[PDB]
Structure 1
Amino acid sequence: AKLLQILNVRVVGSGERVVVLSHGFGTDQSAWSRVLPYLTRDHRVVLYDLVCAGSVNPDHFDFRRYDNLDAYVDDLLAILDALRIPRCAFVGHSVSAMIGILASIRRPDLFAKLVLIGASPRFLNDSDYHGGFELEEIQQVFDAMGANYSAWATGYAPLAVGADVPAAVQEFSRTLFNMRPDISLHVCQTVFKTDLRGVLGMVRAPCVVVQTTRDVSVPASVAAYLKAHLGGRTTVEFLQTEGHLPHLSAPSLLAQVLRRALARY
């Protein structure tokens, strides 16, 4: 109930087929603004901000509570239960792809389909697993985020967007600079300590994994890993564009995949 106000919950469009759009790190629900008009004629669309978004009062961020992703899953489930939604499709980017996987395992009745963008079960490398990051490398990232958050964010934004799309770099920067620096570091630390590999087989919902030509945080092999180990009927949909945030940089192309993936579920 009060969660609906705190996390800026919005329900737009209409229809029997309900879709939840859940943003990732460094953005808020506004990141969906360009894809939204492609969905609202045929779907009731639920949007909300993660508690870590700069568009949420940062004094709600309880570092103790949000020490793991299950706490974010709790917020998502509380929202959907408050809205009395019994069944939906879920589209998650980045940390929200992880939240969606966990949420679908907790509540398989509620999640009829997952669409995962910029998705990984584990970012750190392991003995027989390529996540894309080494321990020493993330240590340096965390240091930079603390030592000079502004400089870190300035360098990260174009790398994340990937494609040379100035408007998208500006827009991602806008929200990245809006994140409280301590919250931003904490969320990054939480993501980097999360390893979902063991639980992927527990996902029952069909899944579409969206893969771009290159993603600075998600090696190509990860999409293949997700397809091999997610427990539901999983396909990989390739977008002919570069970057981690195709909803910002290639919304038309992404909208094609969303319209097709959300046609029946």
Structure 2
Amino acid sequence: GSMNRVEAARNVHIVGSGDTTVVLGHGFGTDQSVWKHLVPYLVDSYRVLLYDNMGAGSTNPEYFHFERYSTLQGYAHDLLVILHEFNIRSCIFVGHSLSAMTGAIASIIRPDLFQKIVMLSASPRFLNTADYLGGFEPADVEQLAGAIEANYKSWVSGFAPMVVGGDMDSVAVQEFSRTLFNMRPDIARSVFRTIFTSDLRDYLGRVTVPCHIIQSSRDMAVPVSVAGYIHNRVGGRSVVEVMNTEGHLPQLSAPEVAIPVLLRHIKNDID
């Protein structure tokens, strides 16, 4: 029989039912399993579409890293293809980390396909300027970069607790290491470079669909002022909620706080 890796790389899964579809995208170093504490609460009222991105599940029988994955613009394009191929008419897009920005970029092109956007732990740019506080100076970025290919075994066990926060013993920190270990060393490096070189701040003014902007109050990757930045720069209506939590992946590490906030913003329009 013939072969096709585009279904396998995207790894599209659909579950539940309803008039509205909710699409779930994820951030660097993880996969669609990050939404495990969210999905059970959506299925009664919504059809839920999950997908994979940012080099997730590299070590497999058939995973070639395509050239559209060199930039975030290509991921955004690939998202629009997914929406067309499953005939989505209007959708509630929920994006974690930089998949929030890929969703934002796609909504500029086809705002009719998006009812709203829900951003979680999102940032338009990680690196600092004189005027803009991304959260990282060049030293910080290269420090993290340096250890990635020297040993991927030791980098993951040091990086994973740093991003997620709290103690290392938790299942959240272990789950993130597990998904990190599915990636290859070389693919994670090229993806890492794309993350920290990315700058999407100019796009924000073009976004016209409603955005709900959610994050942890102590995120090592995202200063609290970044939620306000996005809020002031988006072109349509928007709202901000800083949760009183720690970590870049609060849906996995603090579900008791994160999940109810996500459900409110998904189910209700901007009141």
Common fold: TM-score over 0.5: yes
2:29 corresponds to: 26
CA distance in structure 2 between the aligned counterparts of 1:175 and 1:123, rounded to whole angstroms:
22
1:36 corresponds to: 39
The answer to whether 1:61 aligns with 2:61 is no
Which residue among 6, 10, 13 is the counterpart of 1:10? Answer: 13
**1:145–1:181 Cα contact (<8 Å) kept:** yes
Secondary structure in 1 matching 2:148: helix
1:92 corresponds to: 95
How much has 1:5 moved relative to structure 2?
A: 4.0
Deviations 1:121-159 (A, max 9, x none): 000001200001112321222221122222221111111
What residue identity is the alignment partner of 1:259? L
Which has the larger displacement, 49-58 or 147-156?
49-58
After TM superposition, list the pairs within 5 Å mapping 1:172-187 onto structure 2: 172-187=176-191
After TM superposition, list the pairs within 5 Å mapping 1:1-265 onto structure 2: 3-50=6-53, 52-54=55-57, 57=60, 59-62=63-66, 64-164=67-167, 166-264=170-268
The percentage of aligned residue pairs carrying the same residue is 53
Deviations 1:34-67 (A, max 9, x none): 11111111111100111510267473212x3322
How much has 1:240 moved relative to structure 2?
A: 2.3
**2:68–2:75 Cα contact (<8 Å) kept:** no
**1:28–1:55 Cα contact (<8 Å) kept:** no
Listed as ranges, the gaps of 5+ residues in structure 1 are none
Which has the larger displacement, 25-34 or 130-139?
130-139
How much has 1:6 moved relative to structure 2?
A: 3.4
CA distance in structure 2 between the aligned counterparts of 1:144 and 1:68, rounded to whole angstroms:
23
**2:55–2:187 Cα contact (<8 Å) kept:** yes
The structure-2 alpha-carbon separation of the partners of 1:121 and 1:169, relative to structure 1 and needing over 3 Å to count, comes to: same
Deviations 1:10-55 (A, max 9, x none): 1111111211010111111111111111111111110011151026
CA distance in structure 2 between the aligned counterparts of 1:113 and 1:78, rounded to whole angstroms:
18
Which has the larger displacement, 187-196 or 136-145?
136-145
How much has 1:264 moved relative to structure 2?
A: 4.3
Which has the larger displacement, 197-206 or 51-60?
51-60
**2:27–2:54 Cα contact (<8 Å) kept:** no
How much has 1:234 moved relative to structure 2?
A: 1.3
**1:32–1:247 Cα contact (<8 Å) kept:** yes
* Aligned-residue RMSD, C-alpha: 1.8
**1:49–1:56 Cα contact (<8 Å) kept:** no
**1:3–1:79 Cα contact (<8 Å) kept:** no
**1:51–1:60 Cα contact (<8 Å) kept:** no
What residue identity is the alignment partner of 1:100? G
CA distance in structure 2 between the aligned counterparts of 1:83 and 1:2, rounded to whole angstroms:
17
Secondary structure in 1 matching 2:217: coil
CA distance in structure 1 between the aligned counterparts of 2:15 and 2:236, rounded to whole angstroms:
29
CA distance in structure 2 between the aligned counterparts of 1:224 and 1:93, rounded to whole angstroms:
17
The structure-2 alpha-carbon separation of the partners of 1:110 and 1:56, relative to structure 1 and needing over 3 Å to count, comes to: farther
Displaced runs of 4 or more, over 3 A: 1-6, 55-59
The structure-2 alpha-carbon separation of the partners of 1:105 and 1:65, relative to structure 1 and needing over 3 Å to count, comes to: same
Count of aligned residue pairs for this structure pair = 264
What residue identity is the alignment partner of 1:124? L
The two structures have a TM-score, normalised by structure 1, of 0.93
Secondary structure in 2 matching 1:222: helix
